[model samples]
Target: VPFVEDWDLVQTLGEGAYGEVQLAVNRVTEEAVAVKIVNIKKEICINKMLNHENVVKFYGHRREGNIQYLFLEYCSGGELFDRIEPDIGMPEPDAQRFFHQLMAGVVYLHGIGITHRDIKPENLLLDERDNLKISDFGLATVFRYNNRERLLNKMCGTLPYVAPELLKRREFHAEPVDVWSCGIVLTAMLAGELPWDQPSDSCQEYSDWKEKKTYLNPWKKIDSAPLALLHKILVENPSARITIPDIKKDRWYNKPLKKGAKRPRVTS
Candidate 1:
């Protein structure tokens, strides 16, 4: 299926494994937005699509013959990944601020009994104003445990951001897995790098690292960051890892913001 008008294809914003995304302007509201068309047969409804301040708002969906189209909130500003990359990511202070907001969204989701199984840099989208929105719910599922049915066979998520437990093939808390990924994402935002990118044969090795926040391998030279903060995040045990409240207590967040903490503009 194509857009309503030829001029509507203002720009090609992104292309993924499934389909291409275009930047289109709504004829009625004249507002810019992202329009994605995917092969529906390739798409599966993992969970009843959610709506929240943090999650990307779904405008509508339509089926045209063999293809499916999703009209979503247009984020003209692009992704948080593009903004933070190349420049070695955002400053420590900025990373903390964004983490705080991201947690707020996550906490809200958990409170309502939902779990964003997939949380990564690419999934984190930003509008022109720099407000971050979590997108790509293709792998998102309702947070439920002990229900063998919901927990699908094997594991799923992006390579770098997958939690240690998920990679290990062990039964684990879904929420903490999300938290672990959030910590990794936060680290990437600060250090501007992935901690580990090697192979040790099987998921067993990955599980060991997940079960134990073994800083011995990937944490080569992150000595500048306070040990206390890293400890809160990189704990080997999920129970010891930082919770929403604990993250709030981190020094970076408790500190006062500078006079003018400029908020990014949202073009879409």
Candidate 2:
């Protein structure tokens, strides 16, 4: 059978063993979308259940002869990393605004029992309004103990954002891993560079941070306030890691984002 005439497949975005993604548009209304075809049924099922501003919107899906099409929101702002300056990151205000959005998105995802096993700069896309939209569900896993359908908790994708616990343990809770990732994301934005290449013991910085080491490179660049928060988020023990809700309550969380919100009060 033929697919619907409304959506015109324009061009290919990317393709892999998983499936192919294509840029498409609504023929009559002139709206853009990325059609994910082939894909995993797990990704399709999980994405179908998600609905939030920070999440990449899944409009719907269709099936054709040996091919499947998943319609999704297209972001013009591109990857979140694009906005990040090399080794310097975006301005403080930009980091603050986007971090808030990412945390909100992660909180929502956790609330619905979904965990993005692979959280990194590339997976975070930006809409025209500069809002961060968490994308790519192929690596997303349902967070629960007794689901019977247990996906591997192994560390995959880029390692800088992975939690320390995931590196050393076989099974781990889902939420803390994300908290740790968010901590890395926030740090990358502030320092404009990743503090370390990986979270494993083989990495010197990870070992240093875990062993009460010096603040250098990216760590030195982050202000004390956010640094304090990172102290909790980047804890080596997953049980000791801060929850997103607690992160919201931290004093540093509420402080002004940047120097523009900065003003000296009567020269103290």
Candidate 3:
């Protein structure tokens, strides 16, 4: 078996279609890191370029034999939404705090012209301090250059978190898709379940929502504060969807986790 030098494997953190994410520690510094062993590795390029508090840190990468190893920041708090209580959802205050952090990271991404094609709770990591960090750039791509954006062709991202336009299988705007996913994440945080398994026309529940067949579980119980924001973020038409700026101007957006307020503990 091929082994990467200088680091010792502690445990497997996760598994996916490509490979496993192993918890590894540096021999010299004794620092822990998440090593993503993928069949492929730009993710490195994208990861290296992004710099923000809510964005995960990229240490670098290595290739051993046929294996590509990506070293990333090891956040002990795990996925923030792991704290979400299934169909019961998180308390509104906690979700708001996370939502605030998530949006700031996403807006930073959009400002620099990159779009996180895959955005879901799984990709949102949490540090020991309970702060949110946007991780995983396997599906990320640049959409803007010289103050202009281009349509993208690839059908990337999780089915449930994808925008309606992406499911149509054609070139589409980049930023709006992330906006839509954030909407789904926000709603899931408050409602405790995804609004639909997929946001496609063929998906009956999605169609029902598109048709305005009335309130859908998440939608059924979403309080007025976030309901208005969800309505703006979940617009079927990408162009009509609320942009990050508008979200910053929203009423509910102002209801952030107050300074000195206690944060919720990460789920065990």
Candidate 4:
């Protein structure tokens, strides 16, 4: 109902299966904000612990009986999914920019020993400045040294974006799963389409490394994509996949991303 104790609601910002997000402004600071109110106590507490620039900021949380509300940073720019449709996936350059930002956010989370299990275009957000922000950590799990492989049990997250190992209910590293989702997100962002109408039900996705050649699905509109850049991101093995450091040093971002310019995709 109220954000940050007494912030006034301005308008509705977003709505989903869990709850509705509203735009609010702090009465004292007069700062604009986005408040996500969940009627369920369990979801509010689980999602509040996740913190990252790419992830939505949680200002505070209040619970009354079975209903709980989360105060979150307000992003006027709306959902990234709504902005990019099948007719027009984000422009290649714009996709690169947003992808870089998403990577940066994911890297920061991984560094602090957290894994955002659910990452998709619908979870990607933007502020008024068009800067990218990540949200929705309801399925995220925090991993420690001893319990690294212990937490993965029930499969969570959207089907198309879920990691291969997770679908099998097999114990695997958490960070790699996040990276796999990132790769799928990048593909969707650039191509404006899902690689497979239906992803493999099991670990078939992991077989790319043993194959003779691996080709990312095409972006019909983008004439000159950086093949090497895509190759680095679309690795079959999560361990062999491009790390955050490699992403920073990618040639596509270093130069102009021209065919022969020694370009490396840099983070935003």
lDDT of each: 0.65, 0.83, 0.86, 0.69
Best by TM-score: 3
Q: Give the winner by lDDT: 2 or 4.
A: 2
Per-residue C-alpha lDDT of model 1 across residues 131-236, encoded as one tens digit per residue:
6787776676666545442443347677667665565555766677678778777867866776654222354534555555445443433433433565577555
Off by over 4 Å in 3: 1-5, 211-216, 256-268
Per-candidate Cα RMSD to the true structure, in Å, reads 5.8, 5.3, 4.7, 6.5
Q: Mind giving the per-residue lDDT tens digits that candidate 4 earns over 160-231?
A: 777656755467777767777787787777667665533453434334423423443344444344446656
lDDT of 3 by residue, 38-99 (tens): 71447888887888899998888888788888989999999866888899888888888899
**Clashing pairs in model 2, backbone N/Cα/C closer than 3 A:** 88-192, 89-192
Regions more than 4 Å wrong, model 2: 1-4, 145-152, 258-268
Poorest 10 consecutive residues of model 4 by lDDT? 205-214
Clashing pairs in 3: none
Per-model tally of clashing residue pairs: 10, 2, 0, 11
When summed lDDT is taken over every stretch of 10 residues in candidate 3, the lowest stretch is 255-264
lDDT of 4 at 211: 49
State residue 250's C-alpha deviation in candidate 2, in Å: 1.6
Off by over 4 Å in 4: 1-5, 27-29, 39-52, 145-151, 201-225, 257-268
